[PDB]
Amino acid sequence: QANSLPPGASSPIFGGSTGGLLRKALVEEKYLITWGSKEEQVFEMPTGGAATMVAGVNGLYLARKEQCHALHRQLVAKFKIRDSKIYRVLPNGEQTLIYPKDG
Amino acid sequence: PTQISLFTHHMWIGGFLIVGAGAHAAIFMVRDYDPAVNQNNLLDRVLRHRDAIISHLNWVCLFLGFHSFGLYVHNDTM
Amino acid sequence: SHAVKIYDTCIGCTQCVRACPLDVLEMVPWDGNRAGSIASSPRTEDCVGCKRCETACPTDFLSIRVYLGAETTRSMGLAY
Amino acid sequence: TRFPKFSQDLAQDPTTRRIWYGIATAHDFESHDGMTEETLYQKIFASHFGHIAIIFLWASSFNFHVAWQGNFEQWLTDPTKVKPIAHAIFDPHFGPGAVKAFTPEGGSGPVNIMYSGLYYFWYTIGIRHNSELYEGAIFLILLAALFLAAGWLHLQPRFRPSLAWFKNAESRLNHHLSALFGVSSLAWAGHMVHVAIPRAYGKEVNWSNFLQIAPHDAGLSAFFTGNWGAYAQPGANGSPPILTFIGGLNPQTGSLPLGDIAHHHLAIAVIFIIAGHMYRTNFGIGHNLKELVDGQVWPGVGAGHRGLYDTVNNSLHFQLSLALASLGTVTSLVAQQMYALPPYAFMAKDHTTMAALYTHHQYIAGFLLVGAFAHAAIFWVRDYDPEANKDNVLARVLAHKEAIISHLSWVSLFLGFHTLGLYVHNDVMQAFGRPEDQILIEPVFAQWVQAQSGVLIPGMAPIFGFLQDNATLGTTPAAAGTFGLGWFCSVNGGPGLTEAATGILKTCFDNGYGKLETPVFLPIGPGDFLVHHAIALGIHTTVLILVKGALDARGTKLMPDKKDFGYAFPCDGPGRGGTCDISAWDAFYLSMFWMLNTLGWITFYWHWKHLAIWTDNVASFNTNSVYLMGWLRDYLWAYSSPLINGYGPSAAVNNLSVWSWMFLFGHLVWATGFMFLISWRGYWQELIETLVWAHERTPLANLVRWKDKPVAMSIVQGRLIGLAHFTVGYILTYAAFVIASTAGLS
Amino acid sequence: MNVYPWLVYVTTLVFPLVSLAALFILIERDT
Amino acid sequence: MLINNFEVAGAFVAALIAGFFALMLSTTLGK
Amino acid sequence: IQKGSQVRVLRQESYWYNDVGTVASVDKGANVIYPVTVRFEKVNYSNLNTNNFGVSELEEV
Amino acid sequence: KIPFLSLAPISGALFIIGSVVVLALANIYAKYPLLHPLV
Amino acid sequence: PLGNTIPCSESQAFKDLKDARINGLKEKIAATDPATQYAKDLTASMELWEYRYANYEKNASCDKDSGQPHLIVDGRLSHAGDFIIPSILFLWLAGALGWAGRDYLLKTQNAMDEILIDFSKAVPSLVLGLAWPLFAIPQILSGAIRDN
Amino acid sequence: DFMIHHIHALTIHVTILILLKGVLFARSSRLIPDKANLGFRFPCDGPGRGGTCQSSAWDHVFLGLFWMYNCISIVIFH
Ligand code: CLA
Ligand code: CLA
Ligand code: CLA
Ligand code: CLA
Ligand code: CLA
Ligand code: CLA
Ligand code: CLA
Ligand SMILES: CC(C)=CCC/C(C)=C\CC/C(C)=C\CC/C(C)=C/CC1=C(C)C(=O)c2ccccc2C1=O
Ligand code: SF4
Ligand code: SF4
């Protein structure tokens, strides 16, 4: 609805927390990380708790760019995923890439 | 002096070990927490609403401080 | 936003881009060292000022300097 | 988010930091947006006009409240019994006990008992009516109105002046020494000869009759013919002397004699009008300050003082550092001459006024000194140019800054190691039942200064002795009468000495130098030695912190480019070891505690020495000041008794219950400081993040939103708020003690 | 006594809260 | 003898002149 | 300035200003602004003891 | 260098205790002076 | 007799403090058994205290009013044992410790040896510490080191 | 006794607030998402994002020691 993934990305299985999005994601900006997993594997949320990512492309909406970057560095340091793309999402739905810029 | 000193000593040793309890629960959280072990259990679901716990603790701490020490300050003032 | 400057004392040790939790910095080719590269900051609007790139910089005095400036939502680190 | 308009960088902050930093950078006019140097100096000039008028409206308040609801004319009928009254109380929170407690006998309601010495001031300067207090109130309100109208006038573009008018410094020095310091001293001498001296001796002179009544009956013919001495004689048909030099204190009032005040304000007025003739203005003659400063060179200081004219003149922070250092040294001198030589009648017997006034001026003096060295460090970060100051004395004390910091370090550890060791030794010796093994050092040198001053000190003598009348010093070998007698019988007067027996020069005794309380120089001993070394430790460690903050403000080995980060910044982060409290603001911040500790030791000393005098128990000071349980018990525990019994369940309240409440208030504010000082930022940021979550999810309440985002206070702000609470609690706790312990002596 | 107590109510209680409301309007409105 | 209400009113007239000049100075300092 | 020569550092912002270190390697590329690697007996505040300096910032003792 | 007594805590602490014992026997031998007796 | 200080020979309050403590001792000996380790320690304390007041007597310690011994520091040879002699004893032993630690640093120049004290380089540093002026005066007259 | 026991409830609850906020926010927060990689015992993550002073769980043990002192001192004074 208000937090809709791009087509091609499936949601990871998470029972939803209280560390996540607030009114700023409705009104100013939010951030979106998409990564590619080969299997279903258990990762720590940057906002508290644990989630399971399914095989395929997983997308997750976070309030800050550092939460997405910490999730990406945890995916590198534990589960060896290096194709996370971090986007900046405006409230009108315009999409821009912010990590990596170089390619 | 035995009564004052035994009560006072065992109170202080008790308070020190409770702060150590909080210390090693935090040290477990940094070092020995595994997301692979704790899915949807009591320990994982506590982290999942930790803002609610700490904010409600913040409110009851404010309530207790007003409704005990402001009574003492009222008694000072009157 | 905080202002990030990289001087000519940089040796291209690839440590300030790994220690950054925000991806402010990147490596461009350069001619003044053995490594062939210098750090640069094209994304200073996302910098929070956390000084992790200055803890990791291995020179005498730090080749990168972040200056604390005007504060925003991103630079105060707010999730709200 | 338009506030603050003077900083666009602050205005686009979306958090609560915007308001706090707009308040805190409101008077840093140099760092504001679009600020030029002309606009800087003219806004500072009008701010000064506004502040001078705040001082005058504050001064008019005293006159109005004592004329409207004081007891001044009732206090002239009996100055020794009935207490001065500040103003009356309207607080609707009072119950019946406090309403009758702050009401005096014969009064019709609750009032504040004045502890500032204004009645003694107004008696000595010759106010005898509430109507004169009322015309003083009217004149100060209109003089404030004139100064606000002048500031308003000088922000209009015909009367705004130029930077050349601000940076002249020749005409400014000439006119301040001539008119501001000299003509006003001459005018106060004229007031003392016309008004205060004849209203002391009955003869009341006011604004209707001042043109007809002369101050001396050989009037203005003794001026021009060279017979100046007839003002110092008793003269014919009345005419008490208006220009005289008794010296010391007056016996009959216990205060300074008024003719000596008038002659002082004549003489230093003449010296200040001559001193304002030195510098070069538009008549050709004078000293130009650029060639006068830049011509001080001798070959141990290199380039000498070249370029220091522009260094002082273009930098307002150097000028304000000198002004605050001089003004605080003056304010300490004010505090230390008011107890020593009291200037106003019946002030020395009002003990708590002397306590409150000394402690007032000394704490304010410590503030002005720490602000002087603060603006020294601010000069170092913002205004110092190494190339305009090539090899002058300022660059050399930047060059060997390591020596000054390490030697202040050595003096501070020297003093603290040995003062603490002798005090803790004295504690151990009184603990082990052995007060005659204490290390007890008679202050030989300060008693020797007393001996050349005129105090006996019966094994010490002046080096050049006394003259043939045995009261004049050998170092003042003229004037047998005029000031051997007055100064000698002042500095050896007081109770306990100059008794009826004597056998030496104190046999004379009939001028009245035994009805004075306290000697002019107090007797001193080993506790006085030890607390003077504690005072020296406090001053030296405060100078260490401040000189280290000034000289390391540009850069060090740990942070070489510190001046690019300004005066007040938090740190440079946890790297290279960690850099907490690195800024020169942080050395202001840490010296502030040491200043409060220093001035605590100074006023603790003044208070216990004087309360031991006032309770006739100087043996308690001389026995218990050498060790520190004596300071805890016989000063702090013993004199707390009328303070903490200001109110209670079993005795009904008295007039000291407000000081009791303010004592506990200051304890609360002081310890509330400790929260901001010990607990630091990231805890409070994470706590406020939980509070943000709690507010946006509570229904009936998430519909109310902030416009500035709730954040924790900054690092420098957490330090500054903890320091402000520490300092407010310090001053209110000690003001409560130093007034309630002494007003509750009885 | 010689008290204007209504003036104490105005300038110590009403006018400070007046002033803080006016300063709130100064510091929270855009232009 | 204390001060009556008429002279307090005269002091308030003087303070109104002072308050007007303060109000002018504070606003032109605010420019 | 060759391998194993004691040098004094003339850089003002250095930790090792007026301190003497050992030259470990000199870079032979002329494009390098600071080619001379100096190792020190004392470390800085980040527990490191090597730096690259230039030629003009070093004094031979 | 010897085992366990060459360490700086041990050498420093035995220096502290040895100085305090030599000082205590000096105070016992001199009958606890405040000054050096000249007469 | 200097200012607010007279010596012990004509001091009344020193004589009062002395008699008060000697009579308190005589009452504490006279109420106890002489073979129970309390009384011989009190007689040792009695003999020690009589020697201490005789010591305060004969070398001129100095009192007034509160009767306790005040010490005079400006360099009199009559009161030379107050300052001048424990001054040069302090200079001797503190210069011994400072010169021993300084010479230990000059001979070691090693980081293991500051936490593991080599006694063969520490105790001769202490012995030349016991004669430090003869080794420290010509190095003041020579000069130490050029640093800024 | 009512008022002193509510003082006691206040001081126990604030010591709980400090140590439990150390425990549950040991690993991550909205401020520092990667706090577990910084460890249990770190000083801060810099003066940026406003300043992260005493954000470690160790520092919550550090603050809870003073608050335990407060708690046990009022218990033994009562
Ligand atoms: C005496 C000093 C002092 C005071 C008053 C406080 C007060 C407080 N602390 Mg603190 N703290 C202190 C020292 C102090 N601390 C020190 C030294 C440290 C360093 C270790 C800390 C570290 C610390 C931490 C880490 C935490 C606190 C928390 C709190 C809050 C607790 C909640 C509560 O008590 O309810 C009510 C408030 C009071 C009892 C304060 C007095 C209120 C008065 C009686 C009411 C005033 C009436 C009215 C408003 C006045 C209007 C006047 C007008 C002119 C303005 C409270 C505001 C905790 C918190 O935030 O929980 C909510 C928190 O986690 N403190
Ligand atoms: C003639 C004297 C004088 C003048 C003109 C200045 C002028 C200046 N100073 Mg300053 N200073 C002085 C004396 C002076 N100072 C003294 C005496 C001290 C020692 C206390 C200081 C220490 C000092 C420091 C550390 C700094 C300055 C700074 C400044 C600059 C900006 C001030 C500002 O914007 O924020 C205004 C100040 C505040 C908002 C602080 C408010 C604190 C209040 C007054 C305390 C009261 C607390 C509470 C309300 C009391 C009520 C208690 C009751 C409820 C019980 C400005 C040029 C700052 C600067 O950066 O320089 C360029 C700076 O960092 N000063
Ligand atoms: C029982 C008495 C007693 C005690 C316990 C102390 C204890 C102390 N003193 Mg000392 N002192 C005393 C009596 C005492 N003092 C007397 C009677 C004098 C008068 C002569 C002094 C004069 C004195 C000086 C000048 C110094 C001390 C210092 C010290 C501290 C370290 C000294 C040390 O040995 O460490 C080990 C030794 C070293 C680390 C190096 C030796 C340095 C010595 C102390 C001075 C020699 C330097 C030089 C030759 C002479 C100095 C010039 C001087 C005239 C200014 C220490 C806590 C130092 C201090 O206070 O720190 C600021 C210090 O420098 N004292
Ligand atoms: C710096 C402050 C200071 C100063 C100046 C003093 C000074 C003194 N104290 Mg004292 N004390 C202090 C702090 C201080 N204390 C503190 C902080 C405490 C609490 C721990 C005490 C507790 C204390 C007690 C309980 C007693 C003293 C006593 C004394 C006195 C006798 C010391 C003496 O002469 O021994 C004798 C010196 C000699 C015989 C000279 C010979 C020295 C030999 C040659 C070397 C010994 C020095 C040393 C061990 C180094 C080793 C050298 C090596 C080569 C072997 C002396 C006047 C005693 C006393 O009676 O007071 C009047 C005593 O009863 N103090
Ligand atoms: C640097 C340390 C220092 C400082 C800041 C002070 C400061 C002060 N002292 Mg003082 N004093 C000191 C050391 C110090 N003293 C020493 C080491 C002694 C001998 C025990 C004394 C004995 C002394 C007496 C008897 C008196 C003072 C008094 C005072 C106060 C008034 C000024 C004065 O008389 O100057 C005089 C200061 C000196 C002559 C000493 C200057 C500092 C020297 C140069 C440090 C090195 C001393 C050296 C180690 C001594 C040994 C030399 C040689 C025998 C080996 C003042 C606040 C007076 C007072 O208490 O007021 C009520 C008082 O009359 N002092
Ligand atoms: C930040 C904290 C810090 C810490 C942990 C240290 C720690 C240390 N410093 Mg240090 N220092 C510091 C800050 C610090 N410093 C600062 C800020 C400065 C100023 C720049 C210094 C300057 C400094 C100097 C100049 C020196 C040290 C030294 C030392 C080492 C002392 C070794 C020791 O005590 O055993 C003491 C060992 C002995 C006393 C050996 C003698 C024992 C005898 C042989 C045993 C036989 C005696 C027998 C039992 C009989 C007893 C009787 C007796 C009277 C003889 C130690 C590891 C010293 C060192 O290098 O180590 C030697 C040293 O020279 N420091
Ligand atoms: C070899 C030991 C040694 C020597 C020769 C010195 C010498 C000096 N110190 Mg230093 N210092 C030392 C150790 C030493 N220190 C240690 C271990 C510390 C950490 C506690 C310090 C902390 C220190 C400070 C903060 C200051 C000095 C200062 C000074 C200078 C002034 C004189 C003085 O007051 O001394 C003071 C000495 C102390 C405060 C430390 C007490 C004495 C220590 C414990 C002696 C070390 C014993 C050592 C282990 C003995 C080894 C024996 C060997 C044979 C194994 C002077 C050159 C001052 C200065 O800069 O003057 C301009 C200054 O402010 N020192
Ligand atoms: C316009 C205006 C001012 C309106 C009034 C606005 C209104 C209703 C009340 C006024 C605000 C009040 C009363 C409190 C908020 C202050 C606060 C964020 C405190 C938490 C905090 C503490 C306790 C520390 O110890 C500390 C230490 C070091 C760094 C940071 C901190 C820190 O952040
Ligand atoms: S200060 Fe922190 S966020 Fe900014 S560039 Fe450096 S490491 Fe990255
Ligand atoms: S700035 Fe420092 S950390 Fe970054 S590449 Fe250069 S030397 Fe390495």
mmCIF file of C-alpha atoms in Angstrom, chain D residues 253-396:
data_model
loop_
_atom_site.group_PDB
_atom_site.id
_atom_site.type_symbol
_atom_site.label_atom_id
_atom_site.label_comp_id
_atom_site.label_asym_id
_atom_site.label_seq_id
_atom_site.Cartn_x
_atom_site.Cartn_y
_atom_site.Cartn_z
ATOM 1 C CA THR D 253 31.009 56.032 63.373
ATOM 2 C CA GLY D 254 33.399 53.088 62.926
ATOM 3 C CA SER D 255 33.770 54.148 59.310
ATOM 4 C CA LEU D 256 35.966 56.156 57.067
ATOM 5 C CA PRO D 257 35.933 59.927 57.726
ATOM 6 C CA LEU D 258 34.134 62.000 55.141
ATOM 7 C CA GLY D 259 36.730 64.754 54.781
ATOM 8 C CA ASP D 260 39.312 62.128 53.815
ATOM 9 C CA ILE D 261 36.843 60.820 51.199
ATOM 10 C CA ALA D 262 36.376 64.336 49.774
ATOM 11 C CA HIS D 263 40.131 65.003 49.738
ATOM 12 C CA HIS D 264 40.747 61.605 48.050
ATOM 13 C CA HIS D 265 38.202 62.378 45.349
ATOM 14 C CA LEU D 266 39.768 65.771 44.811
ATOM 15 C CA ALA D 267 43.319 64.443 44.532
ATOM 16 C CA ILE D 268 42.817 61.443 42.247
ATOM 17 C CA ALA D 269 40.522 63.624 40.112
ATOM 18 C CA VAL D 270 43.435 66.042 39.618
ATOM 19 C CA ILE D 271 45.716 63.076 38.810
ATOM 20 C CA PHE D 272 43.178 61.626 36.312
ATOM 21 C CA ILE D 273 42.650 64.970 34.507
ATOM 22 C CA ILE D 274 46.456 65.237 34.215
ATOM 23 C CA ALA D 275 46.611 61.561 33.085
ATOM 24 C CA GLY D 276 44.113 62.357 30.328
ATOM 25 C CA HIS D 277 46.574 64.744 28.683
ATOM 26 C CA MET D 278 49.024 62.161 27.486
ATOM 27 C CA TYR D 279 47.908 60.964 24.074
ATOM 28 C CA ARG D 280 47.858 62.555 20.632
ATOM 29 C CA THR D 281 44.697 64.401 19.590
ATOM 30 C CA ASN D 282 44.020 67.152 17.031
ATOM 31 C CA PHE D 283 46.175 69.877 18.700
ATOM 32 C CA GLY D 284 49.567 68.485 17.679
ATOM 33 C CA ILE D 285 50.918 67.510 21.108
ATOM 34 C CA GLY D 286 50.604 64.106 22.760
ATOM 35 C CA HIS D 287 51.698 60.494 22.376
ATOM 36 C CA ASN D 288 50.597 58.428 19.427
ATOM 37 C CA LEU D 289 49.922 54.913 20.711
ATOM 38 C CA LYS D 290 51.292 53.143 17.620
ATOM 39 C CA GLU D 291 54.769 54.644 17.987
ATOM 40 C CA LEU D 292 54.509 54.438 21.781
ATOM 41 C CA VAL D 293 53.665 50.739 21.824
ATOM 42 C CA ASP D 294 55.871 49.818 18.830
ATOM 43 C CA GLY D 295 58.847 51.707 20.357
ATOM 44 C CA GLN D 296 59.183 49.341 23.374
ATOM 45 C CA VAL D 297 62.077 47.180 22.198
ATOM 46 C CA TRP D 298 65.086 45.841 24.134
ATOM 47 C CA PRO D 299 67.199 42.891 23.038
ATOM 48 C CA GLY D 300 65.737 40.088 25.281
ATOM 49 C CA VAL D 301 62.273 40.237 23.658
ATOM 50 C CA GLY D 302 63.315 40.435 19.998
ATOM 51 C CA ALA D 303 60.930 42.664 18.037
ATOM 52 C CA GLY D 304 59.545 44.014 21.300
ATOM 53 C CA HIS D 305 56.013 45.339 21.079
ATOM 54 C CA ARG D 306 55.871 46.103 17.344
ATOM 55 C CA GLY D 307 52.432 45.509 15.884
ATOM 56 C CA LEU D 308 50.691 45.227 19.252
ATOM 57 C CA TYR D 309 48.848 48.521 18.606
ATOM 58 C CA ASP D 310 46.883 46.990 15.736
ATOM 59 C CA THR D 311 46.665 43.693 17.655
ATOM 60 C CA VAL D 312 44.821 45.391 20.518
ATOM 61 C CA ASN D 313 42.905 47.883 18.324
ATOM 62 C CA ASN D 314 41.402 45.575 15.677
ATOM 63 C CA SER D 315 40.558 42.808 18.181
ATOM 64 C CA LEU D 316 37.710 43.407 20.592
ATOM 65 C CA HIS D 317 38.430 40.090 22.299
ATOM 66 C CA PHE D 318 41.904 41.230 23.444
ATOM 67 C CA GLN D 319 40.358 44.503 24.684
ATOM 68 C CA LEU D 320 37.579 42.672 26.520
ATOM 69 C CA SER D 321 40.120 40.258 28.064
ATOM 70 C CA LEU D 322 42.096 43.228 29.444
ATOM 71 C CA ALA D 323 38.893 44.978 30.573
ATOM 72 C CA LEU D 324 37.528 41.908 32.387
ATOM 73 C CA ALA D 325 40.907 41.098 34.021
ATOM 74 C CA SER D 326 41.370 44.670 35.224
ATOM 75 C CA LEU D 327 37.732 44.982 36.323
ATOM 76 C CA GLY D 328 37.878 41.743 38.307
ATOM 77 C CA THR D 329 41.175 42.678 39.952
ATOM 78 C CA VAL D 330 39.480 45.993 40.853
ATOM 79 C CA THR D 331 36.423 44.077 42.136
ATOM 80 C CA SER D 332 38.605 41.888 44.375
ATOM 81 C CA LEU D 333 40.244 45.102 45.587
ATOM 82 C CA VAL D 334 36.749 46.527 46.312
ATOM 83 C CA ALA D 335 35.923 43.442 48.406
ATOM 84 C CA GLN D 336 39.229 43.523 50.282
ATOM 85 C CA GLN D 337 39.127 47.229 51.110
ATOM 86 C CA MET D 338 35.502 47.306 52.272
ATOM 87 C CA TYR D 339 36.091 44.934 55.181
ATOM 88 C CA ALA D 340 39.524 46.373 55.964
ATOM 89 C CA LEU D 341 38.638 50.067 55.851
ATOM 90 C CA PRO D 342 34.773 50.300 55.982
ATOM 91 C CA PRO D 343 33.573 53.406 54.128
ATOM 92 C CA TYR D 344 30.015 53.734 55.389
ATOM 93 C CA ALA D 345 28.709 54.414 58.868
ATOM 94 C CA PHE D 346 27.297 51.545 60.968
ATOM 95 C CA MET D 347 28.134 48.925 58.347
ATOM 96 C CA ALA D 348 30.865 47.063 60.258
ATOM 97 C CA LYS D 349 28.539 46.076 63.104
ATOM 98 C CA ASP D 350 25.954 44.746 60.641
ATOM 99 C CA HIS D 351 27.952 41.588 60.203
ATOM 100 C CA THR D 352 25.920 39.774 57.563
ATOM 101 C CA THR D 353 26.035 42.852 55.303
ATOM 102 C CA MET D 354 29.870 42.732 55.431
ATOM 103 C CA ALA D 355 29.709 38.983 54.743
ATOM 104 C CA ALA D 356 27.259 39.347 51.860
ATOM 105 C CA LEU D 357 29.136 42.292 50.293
ATOM 106 C CA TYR D 358 32.600 40.649 50.458
ATOM 107 C CA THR D 359 31.274 37.356 49.118
ATOM 108 C CA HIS D 360 29.264 39.210 46.419
ATOM 109 C CA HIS D 361 32.216 41.195 45.041
ATOM 110 C CA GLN D 362 34.681 38.295 45.307
ATOM 111 C CA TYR D 363 32.514 35.762 43.417
ATOM 112 C CA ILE D 364 31.781 38.420 40.752
ATOM 113 C CA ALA D 365 35.534 39.110 40.513
ATOM 114 C CA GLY D 366 36.207 35.402 39.916
ATOM 115 C CA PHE D 367 33.625 35.491 37.093
ATOM 116 C CA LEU D 368 35.356 38.503 35.454
ATOM 117 C CA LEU D 369 38.784 36.801 35.654
ATOM 118 C CA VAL D 370 37.592 33.546 34.109
ATOM 119 C CA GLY D 371 35.828 35.574 31.405
ATOM 120 C CA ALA D 372 39.043 37.525 30.799
ATOM 121 C CA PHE D 373 40.979 34.354 30.106
ATOM 122 C CA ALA D 374 38.022 32.988 28.105
ATOM 123 C CA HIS D 375 38.189 35.985 25.767
ATOM 124 C CA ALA D 376 41.963 35.593 25.713
ATOM 125 C CA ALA D 377 41.427 32.107 24.202
ATOM 126 C CA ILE D 378 38.754 33.580 21.892
ATOM 127 C CA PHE D 379 41.369 36.119 20.693
ATOM 128 C CA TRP D 380 43.771 33.232 20.058
ATOM 129 C CA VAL D 381 41.297 31.345 17.871
ATOM 130 C CA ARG D 382 39.679 34.229 15.968
ATOM 131 C CA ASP D 383 41.793 37.389 15.951
ATOM 132 C CA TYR D 384 45.480 36.453 16.286
ATOM 133 C CA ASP D 385 47.621 36.864 13.166
ATOM 134 C CA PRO D 386 51.124 35.293 13.338
ATOM 135 C CA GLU D 387 52.353 37.452 10.445
ATOM 136 C CA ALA D 388 51.171 40.767 11.879
ATOM 137 C CA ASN D 389 52.799 39.736 15.189
ATOM 138 C CA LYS D 390 56.240 38.697 13.896
ATOM 139 C CA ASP D 391 58.564 37.968 16.876
ATOM 140 C CA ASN D 392 56.795 40.313 19.317
ATOM 141 C CA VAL D 393 56.203 39.238 22.969
ATOM 142 C CA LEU D 394 52.838 37.649 22.104
ATOM 143 C CA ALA D 395 54.435 35.281 19.574
ATOM 144 C CA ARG D 396 57.212 34.437 22.049
#
